[PDB]
Amino acid sequence: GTFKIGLHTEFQSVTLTMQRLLANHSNECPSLCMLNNSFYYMRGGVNTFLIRVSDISVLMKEYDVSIYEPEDLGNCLNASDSSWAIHWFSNALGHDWLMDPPMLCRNKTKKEGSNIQFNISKADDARVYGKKIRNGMRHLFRGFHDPCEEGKVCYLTINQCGDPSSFEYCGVNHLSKCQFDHVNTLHFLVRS
Amino acid sequence: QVQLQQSGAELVKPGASVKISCKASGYAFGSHWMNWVKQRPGKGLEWIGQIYPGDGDTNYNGKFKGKATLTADKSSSTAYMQFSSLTSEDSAVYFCARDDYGTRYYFDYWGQGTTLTVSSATTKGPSVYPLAPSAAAQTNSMVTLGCLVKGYFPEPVTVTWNSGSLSSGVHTFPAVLQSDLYTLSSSVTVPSSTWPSQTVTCNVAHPASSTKVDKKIVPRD
Amino acid sequence: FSWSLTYCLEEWMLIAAKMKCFGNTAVAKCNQDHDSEFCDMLRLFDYNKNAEINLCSQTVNALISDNLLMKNKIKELMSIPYCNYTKFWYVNHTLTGQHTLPRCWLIRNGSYLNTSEFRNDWILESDHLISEMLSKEYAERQG
Amino acid sequence: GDIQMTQTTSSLSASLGDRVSISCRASQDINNYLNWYQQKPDGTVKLLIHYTSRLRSGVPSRFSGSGFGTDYSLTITNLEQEDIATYFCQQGKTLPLTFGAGTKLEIKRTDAAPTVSIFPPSSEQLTSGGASVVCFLNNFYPKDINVKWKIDGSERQNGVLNSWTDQDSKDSTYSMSSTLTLTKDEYERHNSYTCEATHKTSTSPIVKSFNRNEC
Ligand SMILES: *[C@@H]1O[C@H](CO[C@@H]2O[C@@H](C)[C@@H](O)[C@@H](O)[C@@H]2O)[C@@H](O[C@@H]2O[C@H](CO)[C@@H](O[C@@H]3O[C@H](CO)[C@@H](O)[C@H](O[C@H]4O[C@H](CO)[C@@H](O)[C@H](O)[C@@H]4O)[C@@H]3O)[C@H](O)[C@H]2NC(C)=O)[C@H](O)[C@H]1NC(C)=O
Ligand SMILES: *[C@@H]1O[C@H](CO)[C@@H](O[C@@H]2O[C@H](CO)[C@@H](O[C@@H]3O[C@H](CO)[C@@H](O)[C@H](O[C@H]4O[C@H](CO)[C@@H](O)[C@H](O)[C@@H]4O)[C@@H]3O)[C@H](O)[C@H]2NC(C)=O)[C@H](O)[C@H]1NC(C)=O
Ligand SMILES: *[C@@H]1O[C@H](CO)[C@@H](O[C@@H]2O[C@H](CO)[C@@H](O[C@@H]3O[C@H](CO)[C@@H](O)[C@H](O)[C@@H]3O)[C@H](O)[C@H]2NC(C)=O)[C@H](O)[C@H]1NC(C)=O
Ligand SMILES: *[C@@H]1O[C@H](CO)[C@@H](O[C@@H]2O[C@H](CO)[C@@H](O)[C@H](O)[C@H]2NC(C)=O)[C@H](O)[C@H]1NC(C)=O
Ligand SMILES: *[C@@H]1O[C@H](CO)[C@@H](O[C@@H]2O[C@H](CO)[C@@H](O)[C@H](O)[C@H]2NC(C)=O)[C@H](O)[C@H]1NC(C)=O
Ligand SMILES: *[C@@H]1O[C@H](CO)[C@@H](O)[C@H](O)[C@H]1NC(C)=O
Ligand SMILES: *[C@@H]1O[C@H](CO)[C@@H](O)[C@H](O)[C@H]1NC(C)=O
Secondary structure (H helix, E strand, O other): OOEEOOOOEEEEEEEEOOHHHHOOOOOOOOEEEEOOOOEEEEEEOOEEEEEEEEOOOOOOOOOOEEEOOHHHHHHOOOOHHHHHHHHHHHHHHOOOOOOOOOEEEOOOOOOOOOOEEEEOOOOHHHHHHHHHHHHHHHHHOOOOOOOOOOOOOOEEEEEEEOEHHHOOOOOHHHHOOOOOOHHHHHHHHHHO | OOEEEEOOOEEEOOOOOEEEEEEEEOOOHHHOOEEEEEEOOOOOEEEEEEEOOOOOOEEEOOOOEOOEEEEEEOOOOEEEEEEOOOOHHHOEEEEEEEEOOOOOOOEEEEOOOEEEEEOOOOOEOOEEEEEOOOOOOOOOOEEEEEEEEEEEEOOOOEEEEHHHOOOOOEEEOOOEEEOOEEEEEEEEEEEOOOOOOOOEEEEEEEHHHOEEEEEEEOOOO | OOOOOOOEEOHHHEOOOOOEEOOHHHHHHHHOOOOOHHHHHHHHHHHHHHOOOOOOOOOHHHOOOHHHHHHHHHHHHOOOOEOOOOEEEEEEEOOOOOEOOOEEOOEEOOEEOOHHHHHHHHHHHHHHHHHHHHHHHHHHHOO | OOOOEEOOOOEEEEOOOOOEEEEEEEOOOOOOOEEEEEEOOOOOEEEEEEOOOEEOOOOOOOEEEEEEOOEEEEEEOOOOHHHOOEEEEEEOOOOOOEEOOOEEEEEOOOOEOOEEEEEOOOHHHHHHOEEEEEEEEEEEEOOOOEEEEEEOOEEEOOOEEEEEOOOOOOOOOEEEEEEEEEEHHHHHOOOEEEEEEEEOOEEEEEEEEEEHHHO
């Protein structure tokens, strides 16, 4: 990709890679990548998190844990390291621990695995909040897809890889085809 | 689509053990708690315990700890409840039930139930006796006749009238157990003019003893 | 309030896996702290190398322009050409070796613009390069 | 330390199209984690309401749940035939999970007096050595009824076995059988055999009898 303008003047280019730095990821320094138009991944060192955007909610506020404060996230994940990782991610999405609706998660004591749920439905008291959380996603994942249908339900689900709730989606066939993008990490740094 | 099929009725003797089964269909067997429930007439519903086939963890009710043992087989998607040192107090109906995804502690799908009977009584066929009005009786517009099925074990018996051709004005009472033997009766009412010109015959069947008896009700004297 | 550089990039910082040196005449312009994605990348490399070697720090604003990152994100969301801080193009006087400051090679819907789409850009860059060469020669040999 | 569920009413009568309420009381505050199950006469069991008032898919709208704390209630407006069943409540807060005893629904109808019929022992049974006297109390309403046996004018309760039927599905009545079993010798040592039916329908009992010597 180099051509000549003048007899000596020449068009030249250079391509940079941040992968040697994105590989040294950690909870405070997450590497963010997009797989499907429905699967996203955050690698924070030893803790990997699958993020999904669907219309399928498995949690209810009448049965599951409501997270009003970051500390409540300790009830959602097997380790507190992951708890603060998800705290910083929630901040990065634009969630307001003081004003926005509380998110839902599954008590870590249960058998089904970790699952944090955001109601991003385009309807009723979930509409406004919803858009924000999608904007955050658009900032944190280049090329984010908006599968949420107007007037219908939509949810963002976070599952820590390793728990039963990750199913087989955290396998090697997935994370090996999820190129890290440093622009996402820069947006995470700025928004948190 | 979701289905829980339990094993069949069991008849065992005191001090014996027995394993009842519950085959699941239509869902991920390893993602739902499988609970067991015990029902007896007049004793409501008792929660026995629960197993999570995923990791196999079991939570028992203190009352049934030592009586019941819960296991699972993920390949066959089948839960099993084994009873030891059975007593007549253990005769009941046992259901397997499923909790919803997560752990909401409500049972959204139930099996059909399995009847367990613990008894030292031995199998015996019934004696069938006719029940006809005394020679000195009123001649009302209707007449009631019956069959007395006495001294059999175990349940059930089936009573029909005229090979089933007579079904209106008929009803059979629940069997009562006395001294290790069951007794019941079946009543049939018909227009007084109909009888005795048109004969009435009760057909009693006791499968456990492979007994089949017909008894015609004839007027007395 | 903005990070300072010392410029050669290491082989592992580049797709070509070949250390790439850029003259200090152009790299010095990064210090002025203008809107430049290339200079942001240079400052990021410089800070996080000299510092495990991660990408993160609590002073991202001193390394990059948050307004510029926001602007490129908005351009992305409008489906119009934007920069994803990857490939950059410059104009190199093969004779002398003096070049302009690399500027971003934009993408539209995941594809790099064809050179013909931003040809005014490198036309202007070459014009300014030669103008500055002449100005340097003049101001130097003037005495 | 277990949690006791209390369904004070074990049986409840109602006419089709009525509003029915079944109460459930918890020994401890269970925080709306109450669920209602329906058991049909064949033993089938189904979940209808969870978390006090959340209806399950397919449950008709006439069902509803209410309450909070220790007191709860299942309400069935416009009672349909298919609703005739037994309803259990269940707390889902703490293990061990516990159910109520249940509340059976039965159809209401106008009162009907029992039709009484007494039957002497058959010659077949007398041959074997025993003697059973049977008395049928058929097609009455309501189900509460009492039977008295009298031999030679004296009341007898030993050797009596009773069996009530469930509510009949076509006429909503009940029936009852009373069988007095004696020995052949004891049966021949007496003459008059009487069963008396006491029921809400008549202040005096219905009396049916036979004399053994009158064949
Ligand atoms: C996340 O999950 C844990 C653990 O859940 C518990 O174990 C699971 C396997 C499953 O069985 C759950 O249903 C079960 O709760 C929760 O921590 C438990 O929290 C409960 C409720 O606060 C505690 O129960 C309390 O413990 C004492 C007796 O053990 C006693 O102080 C309490 O009184 C009880 O009894 C009185 C009178 O009988 C009654 O008035 C009270 O209302 C109450 O029933 C009560 O039993 C457990 O001990 C806790 N177990 C732990 C911490 O290991 C945790 O709250 C949950 N978080 C959520 C859902 O957000
Ligand atoms: C995620 O958020 C979505 C959107 O907010 C949410 O779905 C919505 O649920 C609410 C109730 O939680 C629904 O609103 C109700 O729906 C009907 C009319 O459509 C009515 O029953 C209600 O109005 C009457 O009843 C209310 C309750 O008594 C009264 O307060 C009210 O004054 C009226 O009398 C009410 O409008 C809403 O329709 C849905 N929307 C969609 C698209 O599903 C969803 O439950 C959330 N998910 C969670 C919490 O897991
Ligand atoms: C910024 O956007 C550009 C333009 O979309 C991205 O360039 C793409 O980068 C990938 C990954 O390096 C390239 O894939 C590679 O391409 C060749 C030919 O196949 C080869 O080196 C490898 O086998 C690999 O497939 C891709 O070709 C390239 N161009 C595209 C996709 O049009 C760049 O990755 C983005 N920067 C990020 C995400 O940090
Ligand atoms: C936190 O704890 C859970 C529960 O122990 C972990 O999941 C268990 O992992 C072990 C080890 O492989 C399995 O044998 C168990 O069956 C799992 N439990 C269940 C209920 O499935 C879980 O992995 C831990 N969290 C993380 C992030 O690793
Ligand atoms: C992750 O951090 C390690 C440790 O700091 C980096 O390894 C350094 O790499 C540089 C450049 O090749 C060497 O000069 C240093 O000697 C290395 N230091 C150590 C302690 O090993 C590594 O490059 C970073 N990146 C990855 C992808 O691991
Ligand atoms: C996501 O990719 C996975 C690959 O395992 C697949 O199961 C799933 O259906 C895909 N969903 C999409 C592409 O929306
Ligand atoms: C510019 O071209 C010269 C002459 O080929 C070369 O030595 C120098 O490295 C180039 N500078 C770049 C590519 O930055």
